[PDB]
Chain A
């Protein structure tokens, strides 16, 4: 069924690559390749507040 004028669908995936590791993308079609990644260091705790209260 059409959602935003689209009868097709697109699934989104993610993964965390450990330092020094290799990630391989291989396809014959239908792949939405990454362009920008993010090198990051996670903290411990915190969450997501959903509110209209201003920062």
Chain B
């Protein structure tokens, strides 16, 4: 999309990730599984909830009876009343249709941005320790157990702790 991640360099979504909108997939000796990034997902839920409530709650009306009744010699004001009713209809129909179109595009872009930013955060943490193998995936140059995975998903990855082990494996494999 606008940020190139959803339906972009990350081609498809995950049906096996049920606890959030954005997240991770890992695999090591101990197995594999899916986990949502709770921080980014909760921000998106807060933003989208606010976006929905704003579109609805900013419409506050007063008590009003639209209808009017006119006799056979009041045709001009009857048509004037019809013009007012039709004019509001056209304004509200046009604005409502376009607001939905424009906000849907921005919402899909917003989700695309979040997935893009999540990938970039991980890439900035891992640096040389992992290889970008495409499709939003990193393949480590050092074994990364469940505890190591939790550090990445929590943003507490210790690059120097594995930097030398990754360096040796990176330098051999590239020789």
Contacts and interface: CB of A to CB of B under 8 A. Distances in A.
Q: How large is the interface on A (under 10, 10 to 19, 20 to 34, 35 or more residues)?
A: under 10
Secondary structure class of chain A's binding surface, majority of residues: loop
A45 B67 contact: no
B74 interface: no
Interface in A1-55: 45-49
Contacts of A45: 63-65
B69 interface: yes
A44 to B, nearest CB: 8
Shortest Cβ-Cβ A-B pairs, 7 listed: A47-B65, A47-B67, A45-B63, A46-B65, A45-B65, A45-B64, A48-B69
Given A47-B65, A48-B69, 9 more contacts: A45-B63, A45-B64, A45-B65, A46-B65, A47-B66, A47-B67, A47-B68, A48-B67, A49-B67
